[PDB]
């Protein structure tokens, strides 16, 4: 059940005026894509508040990759959910190494030592049991603008910074119809990237079993898919259609693909 929202005084939405004209705010299966300008964040603020909603962030830093927490945690503090529930889950082969990060009010974080992300994450009773939405990046990132509630639904993938100008036949979707994450060449909507994904605990552990399953056929038979698991995400979200798609202001380079017009906002970046 949803409480009524509060009074609220914002700029009226007006039909014959669109937001964004520059790029396609929705999907063909009216799913919403999301890009600055296209959403009003106070009053997604107080319907995700209103239902005390906490999102977990799983982040896995394992060997070198530890070096990189420190930055994407603190930055993560400025920038992700702030004013939500946040708990973070960082799985790593070096527990001492996670940096001491100060947090803010209702944040936590877990160190979840490891000795394999898909089948990870697919921990299934603690995250059902401690948080309503799973985000799952990469670490050696960081948040530059806001990445809010926005992109709360129950599954969501992200443009891949890359591609989404291409044409489908140019995706580097595995190919070789004798792995489980094969797709021709006349299908797919979207290029996604395996650094940006995530959804209800309940779809997230849907698509990394399903993922998991795949590469564990594809291993039997001796195929690895040419992106690995972001061959099997892209796969798994052509044929499990995603709720919102994120736009390349979620997933960005700066250093290889400079700040063209069309992103009004870098929010979370690859680290050189
Ligand atoms: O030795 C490694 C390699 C990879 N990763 C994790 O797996 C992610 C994917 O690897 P990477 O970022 O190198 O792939 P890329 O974005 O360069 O294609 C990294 O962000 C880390 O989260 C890691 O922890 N240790
Ligand atoms: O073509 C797909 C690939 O694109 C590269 O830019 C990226 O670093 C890889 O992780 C993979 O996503
Ligand atoms: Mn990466």
Same mark, same amino acid.
Request: hydrophobic share 40%; with cysteine; proline share 6%.
């Given at each position: ?14 039909? $014959? +005026?669109?937001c ?7 999907t063909?299966?009216?799913?919403p894509?999301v890009?600055?300008? +296209?959403?009003?964040?106070?009053? $997604?603020?107080?319907?995700?508040? !209103? ?5 977990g962030?799983? *982040? ?8 990189? !927490?420190?930055? %994407? ?6 920038? %992700?959910?702030?004013? @939500? ?16 990060? +100060?947090?803010? +009010?209702?944040?936590?974080? &877990?160190? !979840?030592?490891?000795? =394999?992300?898909?089948?990870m994450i ?6 059902? &049991?401690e ?7 990469? *670490? ?15 599954? %969501? ?8 100008? &291409?044409s ?7 190919? =070789? ?12 909507? %979207? ?8 959804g &209800?605990?309940?779809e997230?552990?849907? $698509?990394?079993?399903?993922? @998991?399953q795949?590469?564990? *056929? ?8 040419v #992106? ?8 798994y ?14 997933? #960005? ?7 063209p017009?069309?992103?009004?906002? $870098? ?6």
């Amino acid at each position: 059940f949803m409480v009524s929202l509060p009074r609220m005084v914002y700029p009226q939405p007006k039909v $014959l +005026t669109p937001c964004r004209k520059d790029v396609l705010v929705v999907t063909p299966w009216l799913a919403p894509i999301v890009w600055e300008g +296209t959403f009003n964040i106070d009053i $997604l603020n107080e319907q995700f508040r !209103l239902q005390n909603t906490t999102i977990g962030l799983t *982040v896995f830093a394992i060997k070198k990759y530890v070096a990189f !927490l420190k930055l %994407f945690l603190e930055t993560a503090e400025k920038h %992700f959910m702030v004013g @939500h529930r946040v708990h973070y889950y960082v799985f790593t082969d070096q527990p001492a190494a996670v940096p001491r990060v +100060t947090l803010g +009010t209702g944040r936590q974080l &877990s160190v !979840l030592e490891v000795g =394999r992300r898909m089948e990870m994450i697919s921990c299934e009773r603690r995250f059902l &049991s401690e948080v309503d939405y799973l985000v799952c990046v990469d *670490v050696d990132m960081e948040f530059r603008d806001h990445v809010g509630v926005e992109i709360l639904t129950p599954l %969501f993938g992200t443009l891949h910074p890359s591609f989404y100008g &291409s044409s489908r036949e140019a995706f580097t979707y595995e190919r =070789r119809p004798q792995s489980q994450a094969y797709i021709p060449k006349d299908e797919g909507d %979207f290029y996604y990237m395996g650094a940006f994904f995530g959804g &209800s605990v309940q779809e997230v552990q849907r $698509l990394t079993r399903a993922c @998991h399953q795949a590469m564990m *056929v594809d291993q039997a038979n001796g195929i690895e898919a040419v #992106w690995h698991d972001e061959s099997h995400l892209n796969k798994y979200l052509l044929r499990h259609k995603p709720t919102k798609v994120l736009s390349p202001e979620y997933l #960005w380079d700066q250093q290889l693909l400079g700040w063209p017009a069309v992103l009004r906002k $870098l929010r979370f970046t690859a680290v050189p």
